[model samples]
Target: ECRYLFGGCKTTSDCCKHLGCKFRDKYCAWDFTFS
Candidate 1:
Protein backbone atom coordinates (compact mmCIF):
# COMPACT_ATOMS: atom_id res chain seq x y z
CA GLU A 1 0.00 0.00 0.00
CA CYS A 2 1.48 3.40 -1.05
CA ARG A 3 -0.37 5.12 1.77
CA TYR A 4 0.56 3.98 5.22
CA LEU A 5 -2.18 4.95 7.62
CA PHE A 6 -0.12 5.85 10.68
CA GLY A 7 2.13 8.56 12.06
CA GLY A 8 1.89 10.86 9.06
CA CYS A 9 -0.89 13.42 9.08
CA LYS A 10 -1.66 16.96 10.08
CA THR A 11 -5.30 17.31 9.09
CA THR A 12 -8.13 15.11 7.92
CA SER A 13 -7.52 16.41 4.42
CA ASP A 14 -3.97 15.04 4.29
CA CYS A 15 -5.18 11.70 5.48
CA CYS A 16 -8.04 11.75 3.04
CA LYS A 17 -5.75 12.82 0.26
CA HIS A 18 -3.25 10.03 0.78
CA LEU A 19 -5.36 7.19 2.09
CA GLY A 20 -8.83 8.54 1.63
CA CYS A 21 -9.47 7.67 5.27
CA LYS A 22 -9.93 9.46 8.57
CA PHE A 23 -7.30 10.74 11.02
CA ARG A 24 -6.59 9.01 14.30
CA ASP A 25 -3.95 8.38 16.98
CA LYS A 26 -2.27 11.62 16.00
CA TYR A 27 -1.98 10.45 12.44
CA CYS A 28 -3.80 9.07 9.45
CA ALA A 29 -4.26 5.52 10.55
CA TRP A 30 -6.93 3.07 9.58
CA ASP A 31 -9.87 3.56 11.93
CA PHE A 32 -10.82 -0.10 11.88
CA THR A 33 -7.26 -1.32 12.39
CA PHE A 34 -6.56 1.15 15.16
CA SER A 35 -9.15 -0.11 17.63
Candidate 2:
Protein backbone atom coordinates (compact mmCIF):
# COMPACT_ATOMS: atom_id res chain seq x y z
CA GLU A 1 0.00 0.00 0.00
CA CYS A 2 2.88 2.34 0.77
CA ARG A 3 4.57 2.18 -2.64
CA TYR A 4 1.66 2.87 -4.98
CA LEU A 5 -0.66 4.75 -2.67
CA PHE A 6 1.71 6.61 -0.39
CA GLY A 7 4.35 7.51 -3.02
CA GLY A 8 7.26 5.96 -1.10
CA CYS A 9 9.14 5.04 -4.28
CA LYS A 10 9.74 6.52 -7.67
CA THR A 11 12.32 3.70 -8.01
CA THR A 12 12.61 0.01 -7.11
CA SER A 13 14.92 0.20 -4.09
CA ASP A 14 12.62 2.54 -2.31
CA CYS A 15 9.78 0.07 -2.75
CA CYS A 16 11.93 -2.84 -1.51
CA LYS A 17 12.76 -0.88 1.61
CA HIS A 18 9.06 -0.57 2.00
CA LEU A 19 8.07 -4.23 2.43
CA GLY A 20 4.38 -3.60 2.21
CA CYS A 21 4.80 -2.97 -1.54
CA LYS A 22 7.66 -5.14 -2.64
CA PHE A 23 6.47 -5.46 -6.23
CA ARG A 24 9.43 -3.88 -8.02
CA ASP A 25 11.98 -6.58 -7.00
CA LYS A 26 11.22 -8.90 -9.95
CA TYR A 27 11.42 -6.19 -12.59
CA CYS A 28 14.49 -4.57 -11.09
CA ALA A 29 16.36 -7.91 -10.87
CA TRP A 30 15.37 -9.02 -14.39
CA ASP A 31 18.03 -7.71 -16.76
CA PHE A 32 17.21 -6.70 -20.29
CA THR A 33 19.60 -6.80 -23.25
CA PHE A 34 18.55 -3.45 -24.57
CA SER A 35 19.77 -0.21 -23.07
Candidate 3:
Protein backbone atom coordinates (compact mmCIF):
# COMPACT_ATOMS: atom_id res chain seq x y z
CA GLU A 1 0.00 0.00 0.00
CA CYS A 2 1.07 3.57 -0.73
CA ARG A 3 1.83 5.89 2.11
CA TYR A 4 0.33 9.36 2.68
CA LEU A 5 2.17 12.63 3.30
CA PHE A 6 4.69 12.42 6.11
CA GLY A 7 4.11 8.71 6.33
CA GLY A 8 7.11 6.38 6.75
CA CYS A 9 8.71 5.27 3.51
CA LYS A 10 11.99 3.76 2.39
CA THR A 11 11.65 4.59 -1.31
CA THR A 12 9.60 6.70 -3.73
CA SER A 13 7.52 3.70 -4.75
CA ASP A 14 6.34 3.40 -1.16
CA CYS A 15 4.57 6.75 -1.37
CA CYS A 16 1.30 7.73 -3.06
CA LYS A 17 1.04 9.54 -6.36
CA HIS A 18 2.59 13.02 -6.47
CA LEU A 19 4.64 12.22 -3.41
CA GLY A 20 8.23 11.01 -2.96
CA CYS A 21 10.08 9.35 -0.14
CA LYS A 22 12.50 11.74 1.54
CA PHE A 23 15.72 10.12 2.68
CA ARG A 24 16.51 12.81 5.23
CA ASP A 25 13.42 12.12 7.28
CA LYS A 26 12.48 8.77 5.70
CA TYR A 27 8.94 9.94 4.99
CA CYS A 28 6.63 10.68 2.05
CA ALA A 29 6.64 14.30 0.86
CA TRP A 30 5.77 16.50 -2.11
CA ASP A 31 8.42 18.05 -4.33
CA PHE A 32 7.15 20.73 -6.70
CA THR A 33 10.47 20.69 -8.59
CA PHE A 34 10.41 16.92 -9.10
CA SER A 35 10.54 15.80 -12.70
Which candidate ranks first by TM-score, i.e. highest?
3
Candidate 2: pairs in clash:
none
Question: Candidate 1: where is the Cα deviation over 4 Å?
Answer: 1-3, 16-24, 31-35
Alpha carbon deviation, residue 12, candidate 1 (Å): 0.4
- As a TM-score, model 1 comes out at 0.35
Q: Best candidate, lDDT-wise?
A: 3
Q: Candidate 2: which stretches are off by over 4 Å?
A: 1-7, 17-35
Compute the lDDT for candidate 3.
Answer: 0.82
How does each model score on lDDT? 0.50, 0.39, 0.82
Task: Score residue 4 of candidate 3 by CA lDDT.
Answer: 84
Q: CA RMSD for every model? A: 5.5, 9.7, 2.6
Candidate order by lDDT, decreasing, is: 3, 1, 2
TM-score of each: 0.35, 0.20, 0.70
Candidate 2 per-residue lDDT over residues 1-35, each given as its tens digit: 23443445545554333233336543223222543
Give residue 20's error in model 3 in angstroms: 0.3
